[PDB]
Amino acid sequence: GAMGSMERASLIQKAKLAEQAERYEDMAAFMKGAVEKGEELSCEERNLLSVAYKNVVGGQRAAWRVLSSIEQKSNEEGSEEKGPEVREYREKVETELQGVCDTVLGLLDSHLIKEAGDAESRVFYLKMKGDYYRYLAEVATGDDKKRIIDSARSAYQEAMDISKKEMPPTNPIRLGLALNFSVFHYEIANSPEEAISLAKTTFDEAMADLHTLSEDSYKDSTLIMQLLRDNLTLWT
């Protein structure tokens, strides 16, 4: 732990500064250091952790997709052999991506999930676990691809079961979990009908609970509801 000598509160402060500076690798390192202090994370702190790693892995995923596309074209019928370089560099980015995912999954397993008892924390972390296994699945091709997919599915499913029992249908964590699990079905599990059903049912159950919300809560919930609709429009 290179952050072992820094105060927890200083790490959180610097994560916020790194966010303002769009230095997301630094932000992720600061928030990894904060997690490794061993204390549970508050709501704000959980979201700093997720924002940081989502931005880091999001950049890696975008790069991997560019390189994968170049690699597949170099493998089409009629292409001039360019040598091993495209594959090598795609593999380099892939390995770095897998490393970030393993780091996040490691933080969740040591020991964020096991200490998370409230629905808002436990569902949040299990959603993250599903998300980072999903990112591993996006690049997986070996003896373990089915097991990676099942690890994502299992984490999402536990998160879903808790969220349906313990949170209202408009809860933004519950909505975001369903959004992402629906994308898992469509893009990873080759289950577009499940993806569409889940998005539609989530949207409709949220619609019916909006009347209970304040103006600010309404804005939060309807934002994610619009993403569900966006995906449904993409898929139908």
Binding site: D131, G176, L179, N180, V183, Y186, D230, N231, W235
Partner: peptide
């Protein structure tokens, strides 16, 4: 790509 959060 579809939306995720």
């Amino acid at each position: 790509f579809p939306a995720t959060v």
